[PDB]
């Protein structure tokens, strides 16, 4: 998460810059808040999956159920 936390910091800084310039209730502000919130949510997803001793591969499969590596068709 050390890399992801750097993405949260850059995404927080840009969110505050956009929201204070383009307006607290604007489209760019709502979108930039989205980027920060989505990252924060996956920082908590990845954190709760690490305490499950879940590999990064299994975190990938939870985020990408449609991927060729993750499809389980119960024939």
């Amino acid at each position: 998460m050390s890399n992801l936390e750097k993405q949260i910091e850059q995404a927080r800084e840009e969110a505050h810059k956009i929201c204070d310039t383009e307006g607290a209730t604007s489209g760019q502000c709502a979108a930039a808040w989205d980027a920060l919130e989505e990252l924060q949510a996956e920082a908590a997803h990845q954190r709760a999956e690490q305490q499950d001793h879940k590999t990064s591969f299994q975190q990938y499969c939870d985020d990408n159920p449609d991927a060729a590596e993750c499809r389980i068709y119960d024939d």
Binding site: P65, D66, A68, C70, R71, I72, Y73, D74, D75
Partner: protein, 338 residues
């Protein structure tokens, strides 16, 4: 009037379903008006027309533009959004979503279509969690118009459950073991490659591949008395379509092979006509492409040991027969739409 249907996931089942409807469109309360899928309309139209398994669609011309697929003039609008929440089911007036991505099989996942504005969702797969499951010909008459999320179960469950219902009512099934020798499907890798399931990781067209399956246990959802009394496994083999289920049951009323076959023959001419087909011919898998039944009993293979140990074998077109049943369930929901 007619129910507005959108397909989510234009894959093997999604496209088999679409071709099933085009053949039965004359007598139908469903209008397919929208498709969501990972691909663009032109790719979707090409794959709908040119099918390695079904052959070239010839009933109507198929074309496409930036926005729609057209099948014999009648238009189908297309969109590409992985997240069902954003789907324009509102604007499109979608009543019923055919959920055939393979990924929104839980109530949480499937209900996202309802947030986007559809009334009901039909999952072409077993539900995760307590979603009502139906097998046409077995329990589809217990459908309540108040259910907004439904499962049509798996293709193997659709083959096995009608046969089990016949044998259970005729002889009394005490326990039951299943093996489906199954065509490979799109969840297996083409060559040895990363997969969460080490068996599905392996080259599908090179290998016999066992997989665990819930399909036999799920017969207990549509036949409640047999809950916990059935189990089985799957063996994926290098054929691209058509499968066969091998079922061995311990039964209560002693019988013989001739009597088992007669019981299934009579049921296929009466209470299970169109669901079970009875065959005494010595055919192979290719001959069952496009068969509309959920189960084709291979009467030649039936055997009984000791009065109470019964083996029956049944074919099923896992893409096309199952999709016919999806359409059957959808028309039933439409005929009883509340």
């Amino acid at each position: 009037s007619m129910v507005r249907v959108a397909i989510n996931g234009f894959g093997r089942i999604g496209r088999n379903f679409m071709r099933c409807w085009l053949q039965r469109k004359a007598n139908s309360k469903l209008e397919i008006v929208g498709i969501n899928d990972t691909s663009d309309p032109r790719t979707n139209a090409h794959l709908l027309k040119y099918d390695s398994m079904l052959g070239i669609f010839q009933d109507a011309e198929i074309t496409a533009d930036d926005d729609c697929i057209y099948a014999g003039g009648h238009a189908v609008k297309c969109v590409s959004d992985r997240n069902p929440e954003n789907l324009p089911w509102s604007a499109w007036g979608i009543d019923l979503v055919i959920e055939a991505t393979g990924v929104f099989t839980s109530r949480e996942g499937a209900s996202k279509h309802l947030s986007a504005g559809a009334k009901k969702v039909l999952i072409t797969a077993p539900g995760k969690g307590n979603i009502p499951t139906y097998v046409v010909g077995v329990n589809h008459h217990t459908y309540d118009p108040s259910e907004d999320i439904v499962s049509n179960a798996s293709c193997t469950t659709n083959c096995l459950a009608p046969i089990v219902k016949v044998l259970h009512e005729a002889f009394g099934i005490q326990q039951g073991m299943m093996t489906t020798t199954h065509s490979y499907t799109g969840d297996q890798r083409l060559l040895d490659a990363s997969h969460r399931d080490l068996r599905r990781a392996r080259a599908a067209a090179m290998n016999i591949v066992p997989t665990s399956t819930g399909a036999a246990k799920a017969v207990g959802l549509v036949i409640p008395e047999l809950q916990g009394k059935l189990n089985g496994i799957a063996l994926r083999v290098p054929t691209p379509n058509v499968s066969v289920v091998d079922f061995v049951a311990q039964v209560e009323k002693p019988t013989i092979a001739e009597q088992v076959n007669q019981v299934i023959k009579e049921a296929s001419e009466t209470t299970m006509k169109g669901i079970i087909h009875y065959s005494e011919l010595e055919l192979v898998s290719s001959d069952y492409r496009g068969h509309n039944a959920s189960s084709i009993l291979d009467a030649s293979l039936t055997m009984v040991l000791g009065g109470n140990l019964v083996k029956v074998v049944a074919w099923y077109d896992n893409e096309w027969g199952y999709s016919q049943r999806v359409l059957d369930l959808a028309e039933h929901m439409a005929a009883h739409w509340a």
